[PDB]
Write an enzyme that holds these catalytic residues in place. Structure first.
Site, PDB file in Angstrom:
ATOM      1  CB  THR A 197     -11.757  -0.750  10.226  1.00  0.00           C
ATOM      2  OG1 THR A 197     -12.483  -1.835  10.532  1.00  0.00           O
ATOM      3  CG2 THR A 197     -12.551   0.477   9.603  1.00  0.00           C
ATOM      4  CE1 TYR A 222     -10.357  -7.515  11.621  1.00  0.00           C
ATOM      5  CE2 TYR A 222     -11.600  -5.661  10.655  1.00  0.00           C
ATOM      6  CZ  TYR A 222     -10.909  -6.952  10.559  1.00  0.00           C
ATOM      7  OH  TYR A 222     -11.524  -7.762   9.280  1.00  0.00           O
ATOM      8  NE  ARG A 246     -10.270 -14.926   8.076  1.00  0.00           N
ATOM      9  CZ  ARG A 246      -9.763 -14.738   9.226  1.00  0.00           C
ATOM     10  NH1 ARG A 246      -9.391 -15.799   9.907  1.00  0.00           N
ATOM     11  NH2 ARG A 246      -9.427 -13.558   9.677  1.00  0.00           N
ATOM     12  CD1 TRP A 285     -11.481 -11.118   3.024  1.00  0.00           C
ATOM     13  CD2 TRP A 285      -9.357 -11.241   3.478  1.00  0.00           C
ATOM     14  NE1 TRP A 285     -11.170 -12.382   3.380  1.00  0.00           N
ATOM     15  CE2 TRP A 285      -9.994 -12.335   3.849  1.00  0.00           C
ATOM     16  CE3 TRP A 285      -7.995 -11.059   3.609  1.00  0.00           C
ATOM     17  CZ2 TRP A 285      -9.195 -13.359   4.336  1.00  0.00           C
ATOM     18  CZ3 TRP A 285      -7.307 -12.027   4.296  1.00  0.00           C
ATOM     19  CH2 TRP A 285      -7.946 -13.308   4.356  1.00  0.00           C
ATOM     20  CG  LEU A 296      -2.706  -3.105  -2.147  1.00  0.00           C
ATOM     21  CD1 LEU A 296      -2.095  -1.803  -1.667  1.00  0.00           C
ATOM     22  CD2 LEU A 296      -2.338  -3.218  -3.558  1.00  0.00           C
ATOM     23  CE  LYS A 348       3.870  -0.281   2.393  1.00  0.00           C
ATOM     24  NZ  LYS A 348       3.386   0.510   3.220  1.00  0.00           N
ATOM     25  NE  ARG A 371      -1.720  -4.227   7.450  1.00  0.00           N
ATOM     26  CZ  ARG A 371      -2.747  -4.485   6.734  1.00  0.00           C
ATOM     27  NH1 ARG A 371      -2.951  -5.461   6.348  1.00  0.00           N
ATOM     28  NH2 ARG A 371      -3.360  -3.336   6.660  1.00  0.00           N
TER      29      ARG A 371
END
Ligand SMILES: NC(=O)c1ccc[n+]([C@@H]2O[C@H](COP(=O)([O-])OP(=O)(O)OC[C@H]3O[C@@H](n4cnc5c(N)ncnc54)[C@H](OP(=O)(O)O)[C@@H]3O)[C@@H](O)[C@H]2O)c1
Ligand SMILES: NC(=O)c1ccc[n+]([C@@H]2O[C@H](COP(=O)([O-])OP(=O)(O)OC[C@H]3O[C@@H](n4cnc5c(N)ncnc54)[C@H](OP(=O)(O)O)[C@@H]3O)[C@@H](O)[C@H]2O)c1
Ligand SMILES: NC(=O)c1ccc[n+]([C@@H]2O[C@H](COP(=O)([O-])OP(=O)(O)OC[C@H]3O[C@@H](n4cnc5c(N)ncnc54)[C@H](OP(=O)(O)O)[C@@H]3O)[C@@H](O)[C@H]2O)c1
Ligand SMILES: NC(=O)c1ccc[n+]([C@@H]2O[C@H](COP(=O)([O-])OP(=O)(O)OC[C@H]3O[C@@H](n4cnc5c(N)ncnc54)[C@H](OP(=O)(O)O)[C@@H]3O)[C@@H](O)[C@H]2O)c1
Ligand SMILES: [Cl-]
Ligand SMILES: [Cl-]
Ligand SMILES: [Cl-]
Ligand SMILES: [Cl-]
Ligand SMILES: [Cl-]
Ligand SMILES: [Cl-]
Ligand SMILES: [Cl-]
Ligand SMILES: [Cl-]
Ligand SMILES: [Cl-]
Ligand SMILES: [Cl-]
Ligand SMILES: [Cl-]
Ligand SMILES: [Cl-]
Ligand SMILES: [Cl-]
Lengths: 323, 323, 323, 323
Positions: free
Chosen positions: D20, D54, D153, D207, D210, D218, D228
């Site tokens: 999300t 988030y 992380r 995570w 891409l 793109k 983004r």
């Protein structure tokens, strides 16, 4: 002793209990279920066993309704439930922490109880580490959702692993194994469990003492209507009954029936008394699809006094399977 | 010191407490019960003892009603209850986890309290493993139903077993033994308990300091009406009183009465002061069937200063039972 | 760094806090209390300290009312309370399990909070075993009534005993000692606490940085009206101030005032900055009877940059008490 | 296997999850969020990841609303949330006990859930001792706010420190690390994590498969609108894309696209399948700003069968970064 300790624990169970597999929420009406429970309780049976998988949670709903309608003191009852298959989603099965907590909660909600006396792992879970499972069982006990926990269909080695993990991490060990035991399935209860009882105090609460009803002799001439083996979903049992081995055990029942006649009891009474001759068996879980069966089966207690060393040797000679 | 530590613990109790055996919910009216509690509390007594078995739970109901009606601060009270006999069902007795949790919960409900200060095992349970019992006591403490736990009528060896188990599994040890102590029953408190206090810090809260009233001398001429030994269910005590040994101890009371007269106190005052001469006794639980007895008995504190080494030696000479 | 870790812990406190001794529910009005808290919070102070003993629970009521009226996020506040004297009954004082649980609960009710960030033992308790105290502090943390615990006025040896007990029984160690520190009381904070911080990570939250206001110089000409030393119940402080030693320290303040003038700050600003020169002090608890004092005292932060090795040596020369 | 164990644990997750970050409560409408979740769940995805950071808690509100509106069984879902940045106050960030408990509570309130399946430390906290963090994670698990915990992380060394602390103090170890993994960021997942999985059973939930969308190609001709990298607050990502290194990786994508064409799949399908070729990766968290992307990305599963040793060697040759 009609009442005995469940293993080394302080929990005292009647030497017979009443289970709910196939029948409650399933084969029998809720009225018949209440009748069975009433007859059991009134005869001193304190031990009642169910599972989240039984009739997709309906056995639990029925059993819980009966307890609430009858008003019986919670402290007079020993209620046991078994966790493993709680739904169709990937995370609704197994002995993960998620499923044990979730499964037990949903069972308690269906039972309308704050806790069960004993929560069982319904089978072993090779996909969950034992440590997680034992931590999870400890957690539900410590949170007050269960008083104790047990295993079902675990190997002696897996039970001892649970014990090892409890002692290594100061968690709660299981107090009981729920194992199949009857005249045609003897090795685990007669050989392994005694050793486990002596080493780590785990007791035995046994199941299918009539081998799903086969021991009654009712399948002598085929599959009677209304019998367990006739029901939708029990073709596996029909297949067992009609196997070469099924017929070999049916032949032995004819010989055993002769012993029953001499004792003036029924074959099921003989078979259940036989299971309890063993002081290492804490309780035998009965199944009954009608009250006559239950009332007959409870009469096994009156047969126990007649089970001499010579009768027992005669039964071993017939069965030919002493382990 | 009127107040002292209960054992090595931080809990401070008055050197006298008021118990509820026989009287509350039983021999005396609820009004008399309130009067007793009021006199006790007003004289600085903070310690009140009861049991799930006393008058089948009625002692607990009465005691709890009085606390609620009087509005006394919970933090000013030390309430103790004892678990073992909680009902007629097989699973309603003993020191199993099931019964400790269930029994204590039901007691708390009758008491209308969120917790007791001390929960006691009312007697030992050879049918429950010590580990289960100590885990269970730890659990009710950790869940906030009790602050501490204790034993009653356990041997020094069984108490130390509880301690061993607590230390092996990092559980909570018991802080006190509730033991009988009076001039005719001395050995456990005078010999064993001191050793236990020094080794593992367990204190002594003693009971029946007048040997059920026998020490008052009231049974000199037989069984007075309204006496404990006259009541339905106490024929055992009538039998003790009228035994050869009962009469032998009655004869000694006549000699002790002479010492009381010289001290200007009553025999019960002398007997209770005698119990407290011992700094190892944390508190003596009083019983009283009427307020005059209670008020008299509390006067034992004023006798304590008069209990010289020579008086104590005179009492030992009369009793002939120094252990 | 305005914010720093409280000891080795992850809790970050402002280097100044606001305390409530004498003032809240006592010397100052509730309106003045709200003003102080508002000024503190608005200047980045997150740390607020109180005690069940302060104004017999009224300081806690006032502080809690202010938090609720202001609507401040609980997660932005670090609230600390101190347990020891919770009432007049025998069982309402000390560091017993009973009193810690009971005392903290009653404090939380007065504060209208679900938990405090830090619960402190307000002093040591020679009548309660350390094990009981640490178990009890662990219990209230584990029950979610406090996030952490600390000690106050304990010796380094007693703090390390708490640590020993936590490690032996796998309990929670304390994270902070609340100790007196000011120019006339230096040894514990400058000598002992550093060693304790390095060995077991316990931090220092210090108190009375102005020695109850003495460091302001306000008592140069006697006891001003409205001063702490003038209030009912503070004759002890009046006695200290007017002692030979009180006057000896007053004389030193005149010399220190000269240093303040050169730095262009007030003596209290100098004194509080001096306390914080020490990176081992996590926070200094301020007291203020009015907002002008608080606003002045917060200006100590602006003095910290001016506190050179030569200024610090000059102060040590004047005080003559470097430990 | 579409479903697999999260590490050594009993928790079974779909090999793809839906995250999300950026989207929920942020880039996309709540309606689009519901559409994504619905498509995911309907395709067998059980794993949904969010964070208190988030969209300042809005992602959690949206995700929780969708769960409640859809009525999905809680037991069929695996919800994960991540704690570290919970607000602007000093005490609203980090892995302190205060913030973990407070942060997780506030997240659960926004999610309208009683618990998450997995709570993650969103990054490491050099200002909080590991012991405190692990105790705190154990505490929220034991209080029933989470079933399990994980890290994100963290270095292999810090994860193993968490494990050390759990074993030393008998606390709960973490079960998973949430680590970045894609064709341009491989070392941690391919080299370190395997060793950690074999030693202490910690799994990998990965995570940005891409690389924030870069892998789609793109950005070949610059920054498309609505991408983004075009959004307020993502200039850092625009900077990465338009860096020398960004363009070097863009050039490699052209070569990889040729492999995709031969397999008859898209580059994202290839890239996500590539991440899952690894049986040590338990699940890959997908991001999607629209349903077409999500539906395409789920098709990666159909590419997995085509990923031969020769294709994989061809990709390594192009990337030039096998660790
Ligand atoms: N842990 C586990 O995995 C597990 C597994 C199985 C069972 N169990 C437990 O054990 C309980 C008992 O198992 P079970 O039901 O298989 O027991 P069982 O005694 O082997 O079989 C009971 C069935 O046999 C028939 N029957 C019973 N008494 C009879 C009599 N006197 N005369 C003729 N037929 C009679 C009835 O079937 P009809 O329909 O033919 O009348 C009855 O439903 C279960 O309810 C469950 O609680 C546990
Ligand atoms: N842990 C245990 O197993 C256990 C067992 C027993 C008792 N206890 C505890 O100890 C408490 C005290 O025990 P107890 O009641 O047996 O104590 P006790 O002092 O030995 O006996 C008290 C009884 O003696 C009579 N009495 C008391 N003071 C008197 C006086 N001044 N003059 C004449 N008679 C007097 C009364 O009986 P009458 O009816 O004759 O007037 C009274 O009910 C109990 O309430 C209970 O809390 C615990
Ligand atoms: N753990 C413990 O046992 C313990 C013990 C004591 C204190 N504490 C904590 O520490 C906090 C601070 O202690 P404390 O109040 O003693 O601190 P302090 O700074 O030594 O004394 C504060 C008092 O000094 C006066 N004052 C403050 N600033 C002044 C200024 N700029 N100019 C002139 N006078 C000034 C005020 O008194 P006047 O009334 O004279 O105006 C004020 O109430 C307490 O609230 C409490 O939270 C803890
Ligand atoms: N633990 C942590 O610190 C951490 C950090 C980052 C992420 N995560 C988790 O991982 C999840 C996934 O991360 P991510 O969102 O960075 O994943 P990603 O797959 O690397 O990037 C997803 C983004 O790429 C674009 N995209 C996705 N599929 C596409 C397709 N088929 N064709 C063209 N563009 C496509 C979309 O961006 P556009 O806006 O350009 O359309 C989408 O929002 C997050 O939601 C979060 O749960 C965790
Ligand atoms: Cl395993
Ligand atoms: Cl079996
Ligand atoms: Cl069978
Ligand atoms: Cl034992
Ligand atoms: Cl432990
Ligand atoms: Cl005794
Ligand atoms: Cl007696
Ligand atoms: Cl000590
Ligand atoms: Cl101090
Ligand atoms: Cl002072
Ligand atoms: Cl660390
Ligand atoms: Cl990473
Ligand atoms: Cl990136």
């Amino acid at each position: 002793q009609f009442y005995r300790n469940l293993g080394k624990s302080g929990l005292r169970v009647s030497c017979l209990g009443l289970g709910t597999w196939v029948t409650f929420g399933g084969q029998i009406t809720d009225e018949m279920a209440e009748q069975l429970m009433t007859l059991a309780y009134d005869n001193g049976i304190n031990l009642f066993d169910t599972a989240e998988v039984y009739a997709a949670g309906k056995a639990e709903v029925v059993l819980g309704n009966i307890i609430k309608k009858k008003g019986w003191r919670r402290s007079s009852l020993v209620i046991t439930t078994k966790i493993f298959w709680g739904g169709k989603a990937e995370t609704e099965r197994g002995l993960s922490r998620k499923h044990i907590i979730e499964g037990l909660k949903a069972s308690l909600e269906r039972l309308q109880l704050e806790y069960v006396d004993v929560v069982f792992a319904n089978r072993p879970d090779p996909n969950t580490p034992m440590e997680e499972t034992v931590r999870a069982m400890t957690h539900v006990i410590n949170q007050g959702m269960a008083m104790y926990w047990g295993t079902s269909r675990w190997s002696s080695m897996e039970i001892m692993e649970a014990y090892s993990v409890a002692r290594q991490f100061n968690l709660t060990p299981p107090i009981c194994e729920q194992a199949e035991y009857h005249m045609f399935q003897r090795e685990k209860v007669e050989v392994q469990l005694p050793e486990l009882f002596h080493k780590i105090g785990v007791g035995a609460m046994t199941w299918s003492p009539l081998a799903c009803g086969i021991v009654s002799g009712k399948y002598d001439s085929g599959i009677p209507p209304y019998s367990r083996a006739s029901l939708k979903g029990y073709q596996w049992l029909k297949d067992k009954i009609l196997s070469e081995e099924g017929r070999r055990q049916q032949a032995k029942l004819k010989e055993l029936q002769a012993i029953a006649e001499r004792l003036g009891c029924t074959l099921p009474q003989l078979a259940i008394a036989w299971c309890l001759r063993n002081e290492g068996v804490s309780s035998v879980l009965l199944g009954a699809s009608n009250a006559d069966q239950l009332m007959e089966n409870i009469g096994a207690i009156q047969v126990l006094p007649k089970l001499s060393s010579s009768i027992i040797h005669e039964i071993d000679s017939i069965l030919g399977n002493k382990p």
